[PDB]
């Protein structure tokens, strides 16, 4: 949840046109921030060494693998958007070596990332719910369930919003350009989905 706290705003705000979606991504970031605060609260009354938990999990390969997998071709979109805004259309040469250019290139490199966004809040974080939730019927750690129910509601709203956005943009193309993206980035989409 910290890996996607500041990412969506800094990655999507420079591209969103309608402000009614900018407000939504702002509220999303704020909700993620509240989630982080609630996590810090629930960890501040369990282990007397809050500085000892951010040692392994900070850079544990078990989690670092998926962290890098979700961050690499998500910051790729940000850097490509920076390139597109700083160079514009037409090929160029950024200090020596030639600089590429693509109009549709600023779609797939984004759209596929959005797919990750979906599974970033559809499956991987959704199993951890049940994993930390079985301790509910047995009378123990009821405060954990009480504090996690609202987070689950929030995560579910995130899922609904992002799935609606994908189904509206990636499917049923309003502009007559992203249909080629939906056609091309289809089999590799299932490939990366099964990989995740």
């Amino acid at each position: 949840d910290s890996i996607q706290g500041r990412s969506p705003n800094v990655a999507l705000l420079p591209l969103v046109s309608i402000p009614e979606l900018e407000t939504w991504v702002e509220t999303w970031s704020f909700s993620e921030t509240i989630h982080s605060r609630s996590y810090t609260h629930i960890i501040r009354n369990i282990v007397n060494d809050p500085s000892v938990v951010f040692d392994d999990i900070v850079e544990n390969e078990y989690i670092t693998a998926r962290a890098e997998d979700i961050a690499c071709y998500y910051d790729d979109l940000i850097e490509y958007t920076q390139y597109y805004n700083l160079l514009g259309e037409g090929v160029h040469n950024v200090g020596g070596k030639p600089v590429t250019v693509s109009l549709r290139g600023l779609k797939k490199k984004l759209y596929l990332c959005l797919m990750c966004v979906n599974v970033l809040e559809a499956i991987r974080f959704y199993v951890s719910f049940a994993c930390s939730f079985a301790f509910a019927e047995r009378e123990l750690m009821e405060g954990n369930a009480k504090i996690i129910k609202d987070i689950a509601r929030d995560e579910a709203l995130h899922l609904t919003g992002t799935q609606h956005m994908l189904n509206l943009m990636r499917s049923g193309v309003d502009d007559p350009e992203m249909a080629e993206i939906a056609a091309e980035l289809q089999d590799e989409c299932f490939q990366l989905f099964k990989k995740a």
């Binding site: 910290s2 990412s7 810090t40 809050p50 500085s51 951010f54 850079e59 961050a71 998500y74 910051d75």
Partner: protein, 39 residues
């Protein structure tokens, strides 16, 4: 992927975690939210 062309979204490990400048240097990688630099 690539060869770390420029600034990234967040680092793979810690850099200082307690004594970075105000708004210059490495990005954020983990929100401790309990121990801050300015009360």
């Amino acid at each position: 992927l690539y060869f770390q062309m420029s600034y990234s979204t967040f680092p793979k490990t810690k850099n200082d975690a307690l004594k970075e400048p105000m708004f210059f240097g490495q990005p954020v990688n983990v929100a401790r939210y309990d121990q801050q630099k300015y009360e």
